[PDB]
Design a protein around this ligand. Structure first.
Ligand SMILES: *[C]/[C]=[C]/N1=C2[C]=C([C])C([C])=[C]C2=N([C][C]([O])[C]([O])[C]([O])[C]OP([O])(=O)OP([O])(=O)O[C][C]2O[C](N3[C]=NC4=C3N=[C]N=C4[N])[C]([O])[C]2[O])C2=C1C(=O)[N]C(=O)[N]2
Ligand SMILES: *[C]/[C]=[C]/N1=C2[C]=C([C])C([C])=[C]C2=N([C][C]([O])[C]([O])[C]([O])[C]OP([O])(=O)OP([O])(=O)O[C][C]2O[C](N3[C]=NC4=C3N=[C]N=C4[N])[C]([O])[C]2[O])C2=C1C(=O)[N]C(=O)[N]2
Lengths: 956, 959
């Protein structure tokens, strides 16, 4: 019934399109030929779109020719003119001045506009303020010129009266650089505060203001910002505010119903610009990387059908809320028309929107049919304009593109116009897990209000339990020494979090004896049962997630999301090493000769001493302990005195999991006392130590000593830190580079063996990158870790505080200071600090600081950048931001690090994804979360059996 | 009829034979109305039962208590009952335990128109005492049986052929039972000794009118047996006697050529002799042995090939019956019927033929052949329960075989047409070459010194090596030869007044030049693609293969390695080359990890830097080559410091490395003193990795030095260390003593015990102590000690005068504390330390704890497996260990409780091969060294991860 009428209207529209005078897919222009070649070859598509992406960042003809050769001086004029020429198809002007006559020419053709100022990512508060100022000026200046405009009723009036002649679209995240979902209300208040002057200026000038919709991670926040703002009294009576809804989202119809109910309660209409959505590939990739549900439909017919249903619902409620239909899809457009006519809605009530330069024959047909047509009108600089051009290239060459089906794939009219609900196969947001494959634990989404509330509840309960009395635990019995160490809250140093019983060397001897006794039977516990215990530990960690986070927040100063990642990593180690042991338990047939069975197997070693750091207080400790234990060894663990409350929780979970007495023993105390004792003991077969270089070198000297009565060779598994650099190539995407460097350098206040402490920046890009880096570093917030708004918290203790401040003062005598942030008092808050033009051989660029202190180093070219990057004692992490295939390959082959990253930050290594560890003085034998690690806790062995007796051997 | 319808006439004869068989009242071995037949039915239906039942039968006569029989029964799946039942099956196939017991059986067979050939069953001849006893048994048998046969009446069907009278007494002799030290490399000496031991038996038989038949054993002695036999019976005193016989096995690929060759010889001899034509008894053994050795398979592997070759051989011998006399040994009615017809087409009278079958086998067929008027001779085994239960196992194996003709007839109910068809019809040949599975690693085959051409090349290579002495060895840095002026003279350890090498011993300044050359070279070598580095290592292996004999000779003369030990050394060196090259070709491939969209992540390996290689002398090419090629193929450069005792060997390695084409500085050759330049490269700031194999004392020192971070050192040193063992073999009460003694002798005295894997402790349970130790001592008395150049050497000298004096001092101290069971005699002129065995050594005694690295064994008593394991586990070391046992539960306990890195069950504990037995251990035996296995190459590398964000402008490429 109504479905047959929609098809009929689509047929009328396509017939009219046949009468128009060409299509963007035309292969007689550069844009069409680019697309055809891209659609024919997936490697060409990737290389072509990446080349276009980097092109406006290249500032010499030789460098354009070099990038051209790698991806596939007067070739720069030629190629760049053609490619920048394609951008002019989709960008109305480089500035409001250039765009104005284009906007007026469209008005003469019965099309209006909505202006959007293109920009790079807002990473700093300076950039946010500049974007806000651009919008204030645009609204004032365009409203002023429009005072002289004659009225064009098809575009300037609807069925109710006059419409604003000027319409601007605003990108919410461009207005504030420090959105933080864990600090939901504070972030929400700030966004409203930044949006309010723009909406107010627009209202005062009679301008339409549309708030765009960005990626899913800010979708819920944008809707709360928008509705709360336009419900304020000064705005409550203005109809000409709008919000975007993306029909490709699974929750979008629910938002449409919610916005409709809100419009009724508001008592004044506002507008919904209904789109399908711009971030589809991005959303599927992000959700899979995070192990989160996929927020978009993944069958395109679902998106089309939900768009049409959303359109129908809004039209049904047009008295309260006003839809505008943004789509180039003739099926979609025809469906909207019929749903409107079924309701006797007049043509002048509707509004259609299309991108400038897109779907010209369809655009003209809609106008000829009497409908109001509004063009999305981008304005901006060459660099964001080329990003925009790439998105057009990506959409138009998509396999699901309706326009591609019409103008390139020669699809039938029936296929183009069919009901998306027909033959509809639904998709699920849950990505199926491949059986046998390892998956990382998903991290918390603090945009979920229930998770913020559980976090605040877990923090309150932790605070009420202070101080935590921690006992020594040997053979599952709690012991005391009488020597108590007070561990204060590093964010508030007058509060005691833990009172730690510090063991004597006699108790360390008892721990050694208990582990050696237990090893006699634990080494014969079957692998599956050892693995099952490790699995139960991971389940307990999963159950107690919020309590575990709260302990790390308070005792170690780890910010909420850092603490959560620690718990996920701890769970990951458990599951990964349990999975690995289940594989390695199987004897490996070797040789394969008849008459002789020979198998390669692994054996446990004995008592393992575990000496763990504080900076990943649950994850690293748990990885060492579970790997050693699941391999059939027993464990004496000596946790860091700064994080012994965290380790105490681990011991309690180990006891609850059911590890037999003595298999794992909990030996808190001083490293120079009981740590030294278990390193030196004759029963210790394996030492796992992650910490400073000085202690590691000392441990390795001690472990080489064969103690009286020791009948084995000790093995050291050692990680000792880094002096890690990120290289910034001249053609780097500075949005990605600045964001990655900031988080790599200042995440957990730089207290990571993987932290970026060196940024090696090539000379041509130095000023632009360093200015954005400094302005972004000025914008990050430093708070007690308990405060969800903290980007950085404190460093671990007073000793580190004093040492770091000492390093900063020393460097100020030697190097140009670019930035030093302000920090709160009351705890060990070291300030984020950046020095510039630091020599590559300077002490600041050589010695590990483990604090929020960055050395920016200049390089003439990639040759010098690599030499500088390789010139330290360390070889742990390193990275490059580059859009040159040959430079990326040079970095891959020549940068001497154990974990190399291209075009992302250099921290956050995850189990299985990024096995972690390096060489030089960064360690030996420690590649955690990878397929070699567990074997370090074992001995290989070979069992060879002659099966031939009396001239006969059984077959295998 | 038709022209060339012989196959139809053979089928007809077979149909007559089977028809007559239906009229007999004789039992089949396959009848499930006996215990034997029911065992077989269950065995043919279930392979796990077949294995367990045959192994149980094997071990039963070695068990000496009722409780232990019940224990073995429970473990494999009533001692009087089971042993009585199993011994009953043995008496079906063994005429008697002694000649006296067998005599009435032989005479009863005669009354039923069948004659016999007597064979004395025995265990392996491992010692000269056992060889002498075997000889005496035959001399007594021949005299006594001939004497009793003087009173026998004549039975013409069996006592006459077509020419005249035949011997009434016929004995069969197993050649290797007469001598315990056959050594193919000393071919002529072994052949003379075998002939000397056979000669009195052949002579006594001839004097008594007795037929003497020489059996044919496994392929490794087939050619030797034929030379022994033909030369013996062509000697003046024997060349006129007709009643000697030799066995030919038609399942051998070369048997038709041997048949033709024996016929020519019979003509030249001028007096006939006999060929007993069989198919062959060692089929499974030969295919297993040849595959394990990488040698061509000497048997056909299609059973119809054996049948067809049998008939071809039979026709040829019949065609030449004037010169040589065939006897047809087979239970197969097709085979028998073909022989009958081939004889009839040649107008040969029936009385000229002779058919032979095993006692107790094929009763219905046997009786039918006799009724048809043919002469039938029964193979008549005589012997004790233990060899008799071995023989019963061979009968069970043959009768349950899928290819057995008797099984096809009496068990598988195959049609008469299938049973009688021409084996040549549609016959597809097999190849002696086993196809290599692609991508799989194979070990290099060792030389077969039974091949005369290979002995000649060995003697040629030794002559050329000796004429080149002394070898002047230079230091080689950056492919340039250097001298120091400090010369170390390395004497021939078999003849200590002869200098083999004059070695330039490097200075520390030259060690610095070696370190600098390696570090400079590392800068470019680390970027040579894996495939090209692996190809250089493959070329090195090819050069080693080409120069095999020259490389053996160097090890024989400089290190005292006996021929076969040195050959095994070259094979292991080639194996290291190919295995590490193969492994690097696998590890070059980046491993995708995580697999998330939008981010490529790969796990890879990197080289480490300059590698110091400090190699021992006891495997002078193999271990050194494995360290060097593993390091280099992984992308590292190398400074190698060879042992002063074996630098001429290592000099040969360096020359091959240069010839293979390794660029200058990638590998540097730094001879000298370990405490001088070895220490220097261990301590140097550029050295990233140290591979050392040697003594515990040096290993601990090196690990101590390597932990120091030197000035300018910006890395942590890795040590790859192997440090020796105090390795034990446990002898369970039920051990197969043939295997146990042989395995322990070679494990203890091979290369005079100078192996880290050598058995220096033998832990023997009390019940079997006296039997095992007596055979061990007697076998140890029989092995020969010679200069290594002599192919008859079982052991040669120890490495140098220091080791000699140290070892003789240990022997002298131990003689004051422990019972001396045996000390061998040794020649002079070199460092010949005697093989020495002490008995009842306490497990905690110094002799049973400190590694000696010499031919010195401590035999230790154990009350039970509990104490045996406790003693075995009580040392500083955990390298190799082994057990001889036929108890499944005891074998499992050793697997789970013996603390060693290389555990062996029912074989020797030395001879670890690349890929087959990855080698290395724990406690004080080493750390990080499991050579020739899938973890080893990674020790020379660093793991790394490369992670690339592929998402740009909201798009990422698919993989
Ligand atoms: C920021 C700015 C913006 N906006 C806008 C505005 C306007 C005026 C317009 C017109 C637009 C826009 N956007 C974009 C949109 O959304 C879209 O993307 C476009 O437009 C295109 O679409 P259409 O045309 O309708 O076409 P079609 O073809 O029909 O479709 C396409 C689509 O679909 C989907 N998909 C794909 N694939 C798939 C899907 N789904 C499911 N599944 C699958 N497989 C997607 O979506 C595509 O696209 C926008 C805006 C805003 O604001 N925001 C957003 O998001 N967007
Ligand atoms: C030392 C002792 C001995 N000898 C003898 C003597 C007599 C009188 C007789 C009768 C025998 C003998 N031996 C054994 C023989 O050789 C045989 O083995 C038996 O006998 C059996 O055969 P006959 O019966 O014919 O059956 P038949 O079934 O038809 O056949 C079987 C056979 O075949 C073969 N195979 C198996 N499988 C196979 C084969 N081939 C190839 N392929 C395959 N797969 C085998 O061979 C069997 O067996 C003897 C003797 C001597 O001296 N030596 C020897 O070696 N043997």
């Amino acid at each position: 019934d109504i479905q047959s009428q929609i098809v009929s209207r689509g047929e009328e529209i396509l017939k009219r399109m046949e009468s128009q005078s060409a299509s963007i897919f035309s292969k007689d222009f550069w844009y069409g030929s680019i697309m055809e070649w891209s659609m024919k070859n997936e490697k060409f598509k990737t290389n072509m779109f990446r080349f276009v992406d980097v092109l406006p960042s290249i500032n010499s003809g030789d460098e354009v020719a070099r990038h051209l050769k790698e991806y596939f001086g007067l070739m720069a004029g030629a190629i760049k003119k053609n490619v920048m020429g394609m951008a002019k198809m989709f960008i109305t002007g480089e500035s409001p001045d250039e765009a104005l006559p284009v906007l007026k020419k469209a008005r003469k053709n019965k099309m209006t506009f909505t202006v959007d100022i293109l920009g790079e990512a807002t990473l700093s508060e300076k950039e946010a303020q500049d974007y806000s100022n651009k919008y204030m000026e645009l609204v004032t200046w365009l409203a002023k010129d429009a005072e002289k405009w004659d009225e064009v009723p098809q575009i300037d009036r609807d069925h109710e009266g006059a419409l604003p002649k000027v319409n601007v679209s605003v990108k919410m995240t461009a207005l504030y650089s420090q959105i933080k979902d864990a600090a939901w209300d504070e972030s929400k208040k700030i966004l409203k505060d930044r949006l309010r002057p723009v909406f107010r200026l627009g209202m005062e000038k009679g301008v339409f203001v549309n708030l765009d919709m960005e990626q899913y991670s800010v979708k819920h926040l944008t809707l709360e910002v928008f509705t709360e703002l336009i419900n304020e009294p000064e705005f409550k009576n203005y109809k000409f505010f709008g919000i975007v809804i993306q029909a490709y989202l699974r929750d979008s119809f629910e938002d449409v119903k919610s916005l409709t109910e809100f419009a009724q309660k508001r008592g004044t209409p506002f507008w919904v610009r209904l789109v399908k959505g711009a971030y589809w590939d991005y959303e599927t990739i992000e959700a899979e990387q995070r192990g989160w549900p996929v927020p978009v439909y993944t069958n395109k017919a679902e998106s089309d059908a939900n768009y049409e249903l959303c359109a129908k619902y809004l039209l049904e409620n047009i008295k309260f809320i006003r839809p505008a239909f943004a789509s180039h899809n003739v099926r979609t457009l025809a469906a909207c028309m019929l749903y409107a006519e079924k309701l006797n809605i007049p043509k002048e009530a509707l509004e259609f929107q299309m991108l400038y330069g897109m779907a010209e024959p369809i655009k003209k047909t809609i106008v000829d049919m009497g409908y109001r047509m509004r063009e999305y009108a981008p304005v901006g600089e060459l660099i964001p304009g080329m990003a925009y051009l790439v998105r057009r290239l990506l959409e138009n060459t998509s396999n699901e593109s309706w326009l591609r089906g019409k103008f390139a794939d020669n699809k039938s009219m029936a296929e183009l116009l069919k009901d998306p609900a027909q033959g509809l196969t639904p998709t699920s947001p849950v990505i199926p897990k491949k059986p046998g494959k390892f998956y990382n634990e998903p991290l918390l989404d603090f945009a979920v209000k229930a998770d913020r509330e559980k976090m605040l509840k877990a923090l309150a309960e932790a605070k009420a339990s202070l101080p935590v009395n921690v006992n020594i635990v040997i053979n599952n019995k709690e012991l005391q020494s009488g020597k108590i160490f007070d561990r204060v809250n590093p964010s508030q140093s007058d509060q005691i979090v833990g009172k730690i019983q510090m063991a004597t060397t006699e108790q360390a001897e008892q721990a050694m004896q208990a582990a050696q006794t237990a090893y006699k039977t634990w080494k014969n516990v079957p692998c599956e049962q050892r693995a099952a215990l490790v699995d139960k530990l991971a389940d307990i960690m999963t159950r107690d997630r919020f309590k575990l986070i709260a302990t790390q927040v308070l005792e170690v100063g780890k910010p909420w999301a850092e603490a959560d990642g620690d718990i996920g990593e701890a769970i990951d180690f458990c599951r990964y090493y349990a999975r690995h042991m289940r594989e390695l338990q199987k004897p490996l047939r070797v040789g394969g000769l008849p008459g002789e069975l020979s198998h390669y197997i692994y054996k446990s070693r004995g008592v393992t001493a575990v000496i763990a750091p504080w900076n990943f207080p649950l994850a690293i400790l748990a990885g060492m302990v579970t790997a050693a234990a699941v391999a059939g060894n027993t464990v004496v663990m000596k946790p860091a005195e700064q994080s012994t409350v965290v380790a105490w929780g681990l011991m309690k979970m180990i006891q609850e999991a059911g590890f037999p007495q003595g298999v794992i023993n909990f030996l808190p105390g001083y490293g120079e006392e009981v740590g030294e004792y278990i390193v030196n003991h004759k029963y210790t077969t394996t030492i796992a130590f992650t910490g400073s270089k000085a202690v590691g070198l000392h441990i390795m000297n001690r472990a080489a000593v064969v103690q009286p009565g020791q009948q084995h060779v000790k093995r050291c598994i050692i990680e000792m830190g880094g002096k890690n650099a990120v290289i910034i190539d001249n053609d780097a995407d500075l949005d990605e580079a600045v964001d990655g460097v900031i988080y790599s350098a200042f995440g957990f206040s730089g207290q990571k063996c993987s932290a970026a402490s060196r940024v090696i920046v090539l000379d041509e890009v130095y000023d632009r990158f360093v200015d954005r880096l400094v302005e972004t570093a000025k914008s990050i917030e430093i708070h007690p870790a308990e405060n969800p708004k903290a980007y950085m918290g404190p460093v671990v203790d007073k000793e580190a505080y004093d040492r770091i401040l000492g390093t900063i003062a020393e460097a100020e005598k030697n190097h140009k200071l670019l930035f030093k942030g302000s920090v709160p008092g009351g705890g060990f808050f070291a300030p984020p600090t950046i020095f510039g033009d630091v020599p590559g051989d300077a002490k600041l660029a050589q010695a590990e600081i483990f604090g929020p202190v960055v050395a920016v180093i200049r390089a003439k070219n990639l040759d010098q950048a690599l030499d500088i990057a390789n010139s330290t004692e360390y070889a742990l992490t390193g990275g490059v931001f580059s859009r040159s295939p040959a430079n990326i390959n040079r970095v891959k082959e020549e940068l001497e690090v154990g974990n190399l990253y291209v075009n992302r930050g250099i921290t956050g290594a995850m189990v299985d994804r990024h096995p972690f560890g390096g060489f030089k003085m960064s360690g030996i034998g420690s590649k955690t979360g990878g397929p070699d690690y567990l074997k370090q806790y074992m001995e290989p062995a070979c069992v060879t059996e002659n099966t031939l007796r009396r001239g006969f051997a059984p077959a295998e």
